[PDB]
Amino acid sequence: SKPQLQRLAADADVDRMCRLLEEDGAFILKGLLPFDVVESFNRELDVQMAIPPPKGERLLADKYPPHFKYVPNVATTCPTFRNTVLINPVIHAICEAYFQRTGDYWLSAAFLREIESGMPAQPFHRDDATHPLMHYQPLEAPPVSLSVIFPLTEFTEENGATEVILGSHRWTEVGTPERDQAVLATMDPGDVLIVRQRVVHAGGGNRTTAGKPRRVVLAYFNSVQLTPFETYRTMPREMVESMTVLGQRMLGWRTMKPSDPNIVGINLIDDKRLENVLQLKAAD
Amino acid sequence: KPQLQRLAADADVDRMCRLLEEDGAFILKGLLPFDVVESFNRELDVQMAIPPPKGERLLADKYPPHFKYVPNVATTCPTFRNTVLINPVIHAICEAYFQRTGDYWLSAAFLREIESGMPAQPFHRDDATHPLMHYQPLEAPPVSLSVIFPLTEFTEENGATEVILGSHRWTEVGTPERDQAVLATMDPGDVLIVRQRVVHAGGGNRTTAGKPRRVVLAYFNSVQLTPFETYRTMPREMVESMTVLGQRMLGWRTMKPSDPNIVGINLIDDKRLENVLQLKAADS
Numbered sequence A: 001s002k003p004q005l006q007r008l009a010a011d012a013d014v015d016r017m018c019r020l021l022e023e024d025g026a027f028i029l030k031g032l033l034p035f036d037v038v039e040s041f042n043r044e045l046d047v048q049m050a051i052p053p054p055k056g057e058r059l060l061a062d063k064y065p066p067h068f069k070y071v072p073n074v075a076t077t078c079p080t081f082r083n084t085v086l087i088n089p090v091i092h093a094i095c096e097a098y099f100q101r102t103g104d105y106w107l108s109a110a111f112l113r114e115i116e117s118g119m120p121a122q123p124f125h126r127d128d129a130t131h132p133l134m135h136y137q138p139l140e141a142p143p144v145s146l147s148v149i150f151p152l153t154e155f156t157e158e159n160g161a162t163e164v165i166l167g168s169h170r171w172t173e174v175g176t177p178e179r180d181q182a183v184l185a186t187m188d189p190g191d192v193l194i195v196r197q198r199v200v201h202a203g204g205g206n207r208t209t210a211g212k213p214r215r216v217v218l219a220y221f222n223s224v225q226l227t228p229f230e231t232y233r234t235m236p237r238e239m240v241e242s243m244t245v246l247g248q249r250m251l252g253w254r255t256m257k258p259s260d261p262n263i264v265g266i267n268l269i270d271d272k273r274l275e276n277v278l279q280l281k282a283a284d
Numbered sequence B: 001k002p003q004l005q006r007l008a009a010d011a012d013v014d015r016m017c018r019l020l021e022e023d024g025a026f027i028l029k030g031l032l033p034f035d036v037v038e039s040f041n042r043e044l045d046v047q048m049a050i051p052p053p054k055g056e057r058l059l060a061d062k063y064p065p066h067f068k069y070v071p072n073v074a075t076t077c078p079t080f081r082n083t084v085l086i087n088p089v090i091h092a093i094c095e096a097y098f099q100r101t102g103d104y105w106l107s108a109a110f111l112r113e114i115e116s117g118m119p120a121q122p123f124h125r126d127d128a129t130h131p132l133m134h135y136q137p138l139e140a141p142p143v144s145l146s147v148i149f150p151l152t153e154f155t156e157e158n159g160a161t162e163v164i165l166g167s168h169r170w171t172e173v174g175t176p177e178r179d180q181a182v183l184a185t186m187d188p189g190d191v192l193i194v195r196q197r198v199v200h201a202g203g204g205n206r207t208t209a210g211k212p213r214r215v216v217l218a219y220f221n222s223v224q225l226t227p228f229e230t231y232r233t234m235p236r237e238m239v240e241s242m243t244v245l246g247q248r249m250l251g252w253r254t255m256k257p258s259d260p261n262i263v264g265i266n267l268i269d270d271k272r273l274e275n276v277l278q279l280k281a282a283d284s
């Protein structure tokens, strides 16, 4: 069939990863997270899936059909995400290389979707739609967003493995593509799918019959020039201070630095660093 | 040589918009009443009497001592927070200008005070806070607007803001000569509005009489862009003393970029930030 997503081992060099992002728009890393990390993350998500459901307004969940179960802002309820996944050194090597031209990056959102048996596919989209200015950024400009997609169960053809349209970052418009234009990110738990800015993709339908839910966590990174979709500003101080410096930087708790010509920074207060005004301690 | 156009405070916003598109800037005459200018100046006097810290100053430490700098004006100046920041003409302009991008908020508000003997500021675009703006096409929805308040007279001799008309049509700032600019000579109560991508600079103060020149920048950005200054450490008591509009400007509420983002930005728990915080407001 069509050209497929390229798979690389977790120890591959970041240069080939970048080449794949520019050429295909996406690639898969095999075996990045160990089994115990996946297990611990799933255990923490199980708790969030089991507490009483939210009542009142749900800004995203109320608007879209009930074709997924949603745990927003997993960093606030899943220590394995904050302490291990969010600070993974390979993910940050990729981010540092990819965001080199734009400067610092941070976490715009990270959430779980759980797709039960019988749910149809998600509409094709670009994650870029969070910040519509990205639609007008030329392809050659410094990228400002990156999607990091973690399978927490197997992703199969039957259960709706993420569908990615390779090369669709070269399109001006998303349009209305057919599902057969995409290829499948079939993966095992512990793998990761990395998707460039402007690449059209979607969760697939779960065609299993009963009781076989697919779990996916998206960690959406943006240039610090872009406002985080999720604000981590209500995290308690003791939780923030239990993170490493890198974790605090990702979650918006520190002053950050866009590329030159901004030599001053962003997310400042009183001409000082946010973490200094707050006297933030950190685990490291 | 074409000069900045001056308009009365009751001019139609459509004329203001035409001037921003053609010239890149215009002046409104007599927007703020005498008592508002006076109280704002007295509030800034309080801050100007505080000696600067000898700790880190992220902006002030990097540039020559050719200005005195008071950041965080929305916190320390109630006349700004309660009156200037919510001015209906300013918001009518912002609503027209930011129509295509969606919601906007306050990225920074600061004072510069320039005493006799200080030379001119380098030419710049305020856009340099968020370098992605350099790559945005001229016809794309604007994402930044500079609102410049004279708190003293601005004259040729005291260093009235210099604006290069039409420079938003240049790709690069380049190295323009001072004589390419025209002067925003103004009296307190006026305002200078400067479009995204327009090259401008404060002038030198060559006088030997009169108060040091005072200028306040209120820098507005699309909510897609991270505020240069964060107001997240403002005490809840002070936040709740503001109107809803003021809270929205200072980053304390969930906001709405344009379609195709139908969910929002600056949210948490899939809910509006102000609902999670149970924020009261002066006009709620």
Ligand SMILES: COc1ccc2c3c(n(CC=C(C)C)c2c1)[C@H](C=C(C)C)N1C(=O)[C@@H]2CCCN2C(=O)[C@]1(O)[C@H]3O
Pocket (backbone or CB within 6 Å): A060, A064, A068, A070, A109, A111, A112, A113, A122, A123, A124, A125, A126, A127, A128, A129, A130, A220, A229, B260, B261, B262, B263
């Ligand atoms: C959490 O599960 C979902 C369930 C549905 C959607 C949809 C989109 N996203 C991504 C959201 C992020 C915060 C990364 C979704 C995430 C996504 C929306 C955004 C803000 C990126 N979207 C779209 O962009 C396009 C825009 C036109 C219709 N679209 C959709 O229906 C849709 O796929 C919609 O189903």
Ligand SMILES: COc1ccc2c3c(n(CC=C(C)C)c2c1)[C@H](C=C(C)C)N1C(=O)[C@@H]2CCCN2C(=O)[C@]1(O)[C@H]3O
Pocket (backbone or CB within 6 Å): A261, A262, A263, A264, B063, B067, B069, B108, B110, B111, B112, B121, B122, B123, B124, B125, B126, B127, B128, B129, B219, B228
């Ligand atoms: C508050 O007083 C100052 C004193 C100096 C500068 C300079 C710039 N700005 C604007 C800052 C904002 C937060 C709106 C300044 C503001 C401005 C910097 C930024 C981040 C917009 N700048 C520049 O962009 C260019 C970039 C190249 C050299 N430049 C300068 O020296 C300079 O004018 C520099 O003097």
Ligand SMILES: O=C(O)CCC(=O)C(=O)O
Pocket (backbone or CB within 6 Å): A113, A122, A127, A161, A162, A163, A201, A202, A203, A204, A216, A218
């Ligand atoms: O469900 C998936 O595999 C992809 C989800 C996704 O792309 C999203 O929610 O932004």
Ligand SMILES: O=C(O)CCC(=O)C(=O)O
Pocket (backbone or CB within 6 Å): B112, B121, B126, B159, B160, B161, B162, B200, B201, B202, B203, B215, B217
């Ligand atoms: O000093 C002035 O009149 C202009 C100041 C300015 O443009 C800035 O600091 O961004």
Ligand SMILES: [Fe+2]
Pocket (backbone or CB within 6 Å): A125, A126, A127, A147, A201, A202
């Ligand atoms: Fe997505």
Ligand SMILES: [Fe+2]
Pocket (backbone or CB within 6 Å): A157
């Ligand atoms: Fe098949």
Ligand SMILES: [Fe+2]
Pocket (backbone or CB within 6 Å): B124, B125, B126, B146, B200, B201
């Ligand atoms: Fe400026």
Ligand SMILES: [Fe+2]
Pocket (backbone or CB within 6 Å): B156, B157
């Ligand atoms: Fe003179």
